[PDB]
Amino acid sequence: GWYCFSWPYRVDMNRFFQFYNEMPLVKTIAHNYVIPNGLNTIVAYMIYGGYNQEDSVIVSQSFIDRGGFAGTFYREEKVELESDIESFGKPDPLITKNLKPGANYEKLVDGFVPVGTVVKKGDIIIGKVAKIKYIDRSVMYGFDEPAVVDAVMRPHGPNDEIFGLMRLRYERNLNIGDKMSSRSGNKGIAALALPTSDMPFTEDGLQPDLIVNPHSHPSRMTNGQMIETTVGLANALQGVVTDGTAFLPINVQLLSERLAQEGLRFNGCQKMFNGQTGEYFDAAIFIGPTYHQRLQKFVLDD
Amino acid sequence: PSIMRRLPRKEGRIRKSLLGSQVWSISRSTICGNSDLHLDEVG
Amino acid sequence: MLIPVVCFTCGFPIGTYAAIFDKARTEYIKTKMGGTLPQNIPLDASLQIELKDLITALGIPMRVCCRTHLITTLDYRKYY
Amino acid sequence: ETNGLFQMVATGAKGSNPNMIHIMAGIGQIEINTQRIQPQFSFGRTLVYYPRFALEAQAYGFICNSYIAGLTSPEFIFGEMNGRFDLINKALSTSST
Amino acid sequence: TKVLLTEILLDPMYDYAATVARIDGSIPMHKPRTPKEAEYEFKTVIGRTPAELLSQKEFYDKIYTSKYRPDFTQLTRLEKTSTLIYLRAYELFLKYLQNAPNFNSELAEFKTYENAYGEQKALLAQQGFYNIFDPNTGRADQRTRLFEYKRLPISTLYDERGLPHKWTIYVYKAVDSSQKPAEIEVTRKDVIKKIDNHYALADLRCSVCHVLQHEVGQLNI
Amino acid sequence: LENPKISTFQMNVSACAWYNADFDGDQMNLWVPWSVMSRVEAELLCSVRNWFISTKSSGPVNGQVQDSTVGSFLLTRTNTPMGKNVMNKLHAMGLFQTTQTDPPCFANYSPTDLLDGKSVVSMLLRQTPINYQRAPTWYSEVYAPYMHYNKQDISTQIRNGELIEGVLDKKAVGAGSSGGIYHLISRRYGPQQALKMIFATQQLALNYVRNAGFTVSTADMLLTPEAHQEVQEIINELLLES
Amino acid sequence: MEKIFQNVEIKPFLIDFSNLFIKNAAKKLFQLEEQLPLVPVNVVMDFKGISRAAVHGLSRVLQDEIPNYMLDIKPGGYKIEDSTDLFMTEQFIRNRINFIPIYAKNETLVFALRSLNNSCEVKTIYSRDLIQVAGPKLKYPIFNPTFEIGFLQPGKSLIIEDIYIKKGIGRKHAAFNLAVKTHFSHLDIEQYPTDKKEYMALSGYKQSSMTSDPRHHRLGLCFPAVPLPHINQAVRTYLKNACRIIIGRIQSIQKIYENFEEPQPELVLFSMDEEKTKAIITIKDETHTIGNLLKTYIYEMIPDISFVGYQCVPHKQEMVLTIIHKASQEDLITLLEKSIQNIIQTFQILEKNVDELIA
Ligand SMILES: [Mg+2]
Ligand SMILES: [Zn+2]
Ligand SMILES: [Zn+2]
How far apart are the CA of F238 and the centre of ligand 3, in A? Predict the structure, then answer.
């Protein structure tokens, strides 16, 4: 989510700023005091090809492309010097000893890679030479996913000595292997991403952002997730945001009759079609908005 | 530091270095479901 | 940080009516809030604020996804 | 013929009969180590919500509500007492094994 | 000069004063791209060049001061109402750094002003709220499907001879009247062997006192 | 996986039983033998067909899990809420278009001919003909008083690969089911032949559901107003005894 | 003369200025009293005497398999030195700009975005601030001016150059998607009243999809940005384009089928018996559209075929069509050519009816 409101002024390590956040359609009293983190993803509770079994989930590729759970991931690189022994600068091969083999030193400008360039594995991001003629104490970018240099400064440490501070950013969309969760504790790994025309759709054109297995419910008994979809389905059509705080009086029978008041079915299920074949399922499918949240466990980092 | 302090525990010589090993040519990743793969296949 | 340009789910151009929809909301809410302080509006327990007819008058269809993302999206300008 | 919750349980795909009963009918007595809720809140009281030497079954972990109906505050506390044991024993099922 | 510029360029005060200077055009809207641009921006923001700064011992006395001096006495509730808050906040920040007289009272006055302003901004940030009302009442719905304790008659557990009920006999009634026989009474073992889809489970029967469950209220309590 | 945007190790859900794994965020190690001696040992000793039968319990480890379990029930179920559980020639051919086995012969079928789910299953079990006769998990004496069982669903019989009657569920096709379909195929045709049939029957079940549909809703967990009063009466009788 | 589809309904989505809140907000935001230059258009089409493979393939192509245009930023367009705003990052603004629905005539138009905030209040950047810097001067707008591109803190800037029109299909990136689904139904299958509690778990149709074979369909799709005075011209064009796309892809397979004597990696022929022939057609980067069309029409041509299937595997990026039939190789290839010709004729008739219906 918005992990901090002053993020551009900070140089943090392993911090993710998710661009888009939504208030839940069924919110709680906790959202009066903290900013909500997540999105009101449309979720279909159905079997679709077997790619959603055992905590697996099927994501819409179009939902990913539009920025769903997308954000920027940050890393820092702090490099200190020795007093008058070490210095920042581009090493030269003629007089410097033990340069890194097969390393790129050509992106450096005055010892630091300039802000705005893409650094890949095997690039030197900070040039650092110690004088004895010189020993190459440089720092190489050892990550398999490329970054972009976001901010470079040379602040003064506690001992009034210069050190190098680098901020690297990563454009992180949702991708296969990333972890999402509902507010009822049902966490899943994105297993398959389908295009728009391959996702299932209802008679009215509604398609899900996520397809979760119905088998995640019966043993886990996360009934607040199913009630949230039922309530939020009528919230969206009515144009309202309600409160779903714990221990508030609810009646699932009356919340289900609220669906039929808005033109839907009692169970919230709709006639659905297979996006690949164009054929309708014989069973109506429970599809509706369920607030989902992306857990900061990235497959690119693991 | 002592010579015999290197031996005893789970982080010691015998259990960390002799009964186990850091190895090369190995990969790790998050696992995911795929119904088009056979049971004896890994994607 | 803003209402999305298109609906996250189906891609309908939600954003072209976002700005208008935002400001109309405030006026509508100013009609119904009463004496309750603004930050206690989600606590009033007597408010019934329905935006259905406003979004319909914008021309946006009756799609669950589009109205969900229009209604629920947080605006970074209002918190920073 | 049509209920997906029943078909997942009846065929053996997922869930059990007590899972359906808990969701739909009632949770019943919370048992920890084959016992009811022990009076741990000051000598004869199980919680601040029940008097001392209370006789009703609700005071000792009998949850009358189902998950669909929702639990009251004392029923959620007794449910959290039972559910905390599952988390503790799962952590112990790794180290002790 | 270079070490002092690197020291001061990392000061948040410098960024705030540079922003205030950019707003009213005292410095270019882009970050300096040349040493001359950096020197000019430093001279404008800090009020003196790096060489004349360390020469001496004052630093905060001549930091930029916004050009437009709006009237902040309309911040007494009485473009505007947001320009005033910003400019008065920067001016009060500069007064704080200079330990100006009567700062502590003006700070509380501006705190009240900006608390009212934040009340407005919290009004702008509201997305709506709805309460499902019970039609019978006119306020938030209190109808629930929670368990309600009720002392049942003792005949629901015991018969007129003091014995408990055993609801182990299942009574099935034919759905269609032409079906013969009209009723069948079977136990759990023989349900699959004697009952088909032509029958519906009507009631349970006690295997001790032989009473239908719905006819248990006919027992003398 | 040629897609450059995939960083995960992917495997079939029926292979998870070997590792006690699931897809909530588990990480697994993988190394490829480069030595000739280790490559020979990998494929002759350590292949996962060698651990289809448990060393601990002497029973099968793999089977259908959660989607080909309920999917096999739906496919082999006698009656659908819309009449007999049959499908035309085009949709029967579509169940085999993913199994990656040799397609059966549908030449003796008009486009309007109707095939039931046990005929389609038998078209796959003819390759490994086994014999099986047990009551399915579907039939429970607990449910019998309050629901009408179809007499053709509660007696699962397979004769030389022909599903004569009954439904396929956890008892016949589930993972860990001793004496089940894949345990019997292993005992007569080898554990590698059993693994091939677990995949093939999984694709039949998943291709059936992709036209039949399967969902869970909030209304699946909601009692009727009359049933809620009956539950309250039962709990009041418990508290009366207390 | 086969009238495959008739009864087209075209209806734009318009702003209701009768509502006073909307009217006042639009007036004192954008000085807006008329409709926007580009409006979404809902198009509902009735097809008769056609399989749902063809209609659903048309729908899929109109959704995310038709060439479309978006706005993108050329590398180096985002000016880091000039954009002093710390919150409007290039990823955010690029994602916003990619998804503005455009109705462009050529790929030559180049735009720029030069926003300065000389005020003490946060300033919002809209689409009306996108100035055209290259290409012939626009006589009609290609996007609406009411999109919130971003916002600048007091004293900040945002300079973006080299904003250009990019072409692609929505199957690769969703910013090239064209149509959103608004309706799909079969008019020749009866339906239950599903508001009743004994039918609400079922889809509603009185025939199972495992047995039904509908030939009469209603399909409704919404196009997101169409000029108001030329709506009928745009929709018609879109429909015709979709048909051509399908025809082209089908014709690609016709190039394989007429080279079956020449060894070809995309076509493998087996003689399983002395009388049974097997054909396997593997096409890279093909989808369920063409696979389902091919399977359906081969099945129509050979009703007593031994097998036909069209497996499209997600992790293989391949469509593999398997055909097993009791003819020889030459007879099988002749039948397959007949099936492909039937597909081509169907979509040519669709083009003709699109021209006939929309004036
Ligand atoms: Mg796990
Ligand atoms: Zn939408
Ligand atoms: Zn009795």
Answer: 16
